[PDB]
From a paper:
AT118i4h32 is a nanobody antagonist for the angiotensin II type 1 receptor (AT1R), a G protein-coupled receptor (GPCR) that is a central regulator of blood pressure and renal function. AT118i4h32 directly competes with the binding of small molecule and peptide ligands to the AT1R and is active in vivo, reducing mouse blood pressure to a comparable degree as the clinically used angiotensin receptor blocker losartan. We demonstrate successful use of our software on three polyreactive nanobodies, including AT118i4h32, a nanobody antagonist of the angiotensin II type I receptor (AT1R), where we reduce polyreactivity without compromising binding affinity or target-specific pharmacology. Synthetic nanobodies provide an ideal reductionist system to probe polyreactivity in the context of a fixed framework without the influence of heavy and light chain pairing effects.
To investigate how the G26D27 T57I65 substitutions alter AT118i4h32’s structure and contribute to reduce polyreactivity, we crystallized AT118i4h32 G26D27 T57I65 and solved the structure at 1.6 Å resolution. The T57I65 substitution is located at the end of CDR2. I5765 forms more favorable hydrophobic interactions with neighboring I5156 and I65 side chains than T5765. In the case of AT118i4h32, maintaining this hydrophobic interaction is essential for antigen recognition, as the T57D65 substitution diminished AT1R binding two-fold. While the T57I65 mildly decreases polyreactivity, AT118i4h32 variants containing the T57I65 substitutions had slightly decreased thermal stability, indicating that reduced polyreactivity is not necessarily correlated with thermal stability. Residue D2627, found at the N-terminus of helical CDR1, forms a hydrogen bond with the side chain of framework residue N76 in all eight copies of the nanobody in the crystal structure’s asymmetric unit. This hydrogen bond rigidifies the CDR1 position and may reduce the flexibility of the nanobody’s CDR regions. Additionally, the G26D27 substitution improves AT118i4h32’s stability; we observed a five-fold increase in AT118i4h32 G26D27 yield from E. coli and a two-degree increase in melting temperature of the G26D27 variant over wild-type levels. Two AT118i4h32 variants, G26D27 and T57I65, retained at least 80% of wild-type binding levels to the AT1R. AT118i4h32 variants containing G26D27 and T57I65 maintain affinity for AT1R and the ability to act as receptor antagonists, displacing small molecule orthosteric antagonists and suppressing receptor signaling upon angiotensin II (AngII) stimulation.
Author numbering: -1 to 118
Write the structure that this text describes.
């Protein structure tokens, strides 16, 4: 059998113009072959794409974060990072890591989310 685990950290409270760095640590099964993405959801709104990496396609960013957020990964730690710069109040949301491999797995795996609050 294989273990599936996604662990997010790095959320917190900052002011407009501030910055954060989120991390998503994945089990080996997931990290070696799945596309890994960040999504976010504010209360009352739908969940939306932020950025993604790996899984056989190139890095992709949502329009609303291009140039301000940067996704990367460290194979020695099985971890994906989201460097978040120039934060705006409208970036306030729960940020979720997700893993998906649509050619071979009918399941999307989600972390439980980390809260990002941008408030003056």
């Amino acid at each position: 059998m294989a273990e599936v685990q996604l662990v997010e950290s790095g959320g917190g409270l900052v002011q407009p113009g501030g910055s954060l760095r989120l991390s998503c640590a994945a089990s080996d099964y997931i990290y070696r072959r799945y596309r890994m993405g960040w999504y976010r959801q504010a209360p009352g709104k739908g969940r939306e794409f932020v950025a993604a990496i790996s899984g056989g396609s190139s890095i992709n960013y949502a329009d609303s974060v291009k140039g301000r957020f940067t996704i990367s990964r460290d194979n020695s730690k099985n971890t994906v990072y989201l460097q978040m710069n120039s934060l705006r109040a409208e970036d306030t949301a729960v940020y979720y890591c997700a893993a998906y491999r649509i050619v071979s797995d009918p399941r999307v795996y989600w972390g439980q989310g980390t809260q990002v609050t941008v408030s003056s």
